């Protein structure tokens, strides 16, 4: 927290007395719609605690991309204060688009929404330390009125480090190896999924029977023979068990920005 305060530029910094709180949003903490140095915003709010506070801040601060959720500023005077303000957008979540209001897309629209969440990825991947999204779903997706995306909630991200196996059952050798940026190609290739079927992953199993099955069984979700092939290639590449053997960003955004010269 000391730490913290000497590091973050000093116009990041925010009073809690600079927030209006108005509606709440999502619900670890609570989410709030509001208003700050007059701008409309998301507030973020907290309920080992202080660590994750912080982490979440000096990964938020370093953040500019247009496909990424625009940072504002944080409260730290205190650990009962603590919170996260970034930009507030309208549109809402691709999750609430597509499964609440079940609003139907064409081709162009998905794949615009799915090269910016790309574009975001790609982003955080190559900047010099390389950041790990780690919590990617429809409802970190969210969306401008005009169609185009941005990735939000960097409340489990990470940064990027830098026995005899032979014998090793698959969980144990999977807990040794240490996860990398593929860990995020995985959760993008179930969103593209849910993107073009407009359904959630595995929708009539348990998050974590769906987990289950993926991780243990090797299921996967149907690829109906409908999807076009460029696509059907990178969920098919994007959502391998071997981590190595998922598609970097930057080549998803080559192929779906492809896609869009023939929509
Ligand atoms: C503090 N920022 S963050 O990136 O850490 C984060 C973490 C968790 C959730 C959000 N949510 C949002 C939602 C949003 N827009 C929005 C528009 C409409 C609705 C409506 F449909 F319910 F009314 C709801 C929401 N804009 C920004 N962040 C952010």
Same mark, same amino acid.
């Given at each position: 927290?000391?730490? /913290?305060?000497?590091?973050?530029?000093?116009?990041?910094?925010?009073?809690?007395?600079?927030? $209006?709180?108005?509606?709440?949003?999502?619900?670890?903490?609570? &989410?709030?719609?509001?208003?700050?140095?007059?701008?409309?915003?998301?507030?973020?709010?907290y309920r080992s605690d202080?660590?994750?506070?912080?982490?979440?801040?000096?990964?938020?601060?370093?953040?500019?991309?247009?496909?990424?959720?625009?940072?504002?500023?944080?409260? /730290?005077?205190?650990?009962?204060?603590?919170?996260?303000? =970034?930009?507030?957008?309208?549109?809402?979540?691709?999750?609430?688009?597509?499964?609440?209001?079940?609003?139907?897309?064409?081709?162009?629209?998905? /794949?615009?929404?799915?090269?910016? &969440?790309?574009?975001?990825? $790609?982003?955080?991947?190559?900047?010099?330390?390389?950041?790990?999204?780690?919590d990617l779903n429809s409802?970190?997706? /969210?969306?401008?009125?005009? %169609?185009?995306?941005? &990735?939000?909630?960097? %409340?489990?991200?990470?940064?990027?480090?830098?026995?005899?196996?032979?014998?090793?059952?698959?969980?144990?050798? =999977?807990?040794?190896?240490?996860? =990398?940026?593929?860990?995020?190609?995985?959760?993008?290739?179930?969103?593209?999924?849910?993107?073009?079927?407009?359904?959630?992953?595995?929708?009539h199993l348990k998050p974590?029977?769906?987990?289950?099955?993926?991780?243990?069984?090797?299921?996967?979700?149907?690829?109906?023979?409908?999807?076009?092939?460029?696509?059907?290639?990178?969920?098919?590449?994007?959502?391998?068990?071997?981590?190595?053997?998922?598609?970097?960003?930057? $080549?998803?955004?080559?192929?779906?920005?492809?896609?869009?010269?023939?929509?």
């Open positions: 927290i000391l730490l /913290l305060r000497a590091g973050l530029p000093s116009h990041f910094h925010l009073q809690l007395s600079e927030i $209006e709180f108005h509606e709440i949003i999502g619900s670890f903490g609570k &989410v709030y719609k509001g208003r700050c140095r007059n701008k409309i915003v998301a507030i973020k709010r202080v660590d994750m506070f912080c982490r979440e801040v000096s990964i938020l601060c370093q953040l500019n991309h247009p496909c990424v959720i625009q940072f504002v500023g944080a409260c /730290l005077n205190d650990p009962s204060q603590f919170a996260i303000v =970034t930009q507030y957008i309208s549109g809402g979540s691709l999750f609430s688009l597509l499964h609440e209001q079940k609003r139907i897309l064409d081709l162009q629209s998905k /794949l615009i929404i799915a090269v910016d &969440v790309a574009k975001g990825m $790609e982003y955080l991947h190559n900047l010099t330390q390389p950041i790990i999204h780690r409802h970190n997706i /969210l969306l401008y009125e005009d %169609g185009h995306a941005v &990735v939000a909630d960097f %409340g489990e991200s990470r940064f990027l480090q830098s026995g005899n196996l032979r014998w090793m059952a698959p969980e144990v050798f =999977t807990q040794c190896t240490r996860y =990398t940026i593929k860990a995020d190609v995985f959760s993008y290739a179930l969103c593209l999924w849910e993107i073009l079927t407009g359904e959630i992953p595995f929708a974590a029977a769906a987990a289950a099955d993926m991780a243990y069984h090797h299921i996967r979700p149907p690829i109906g023979y409908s999807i076009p092939k460029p696509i059907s290639s990178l969920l098919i590449r994007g959502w391998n068990a071997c981590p190595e053997g998922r598609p970097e960003f930057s $080549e998803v955004v080559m192929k779906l920005e492809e896609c869009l010269c023939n929509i």
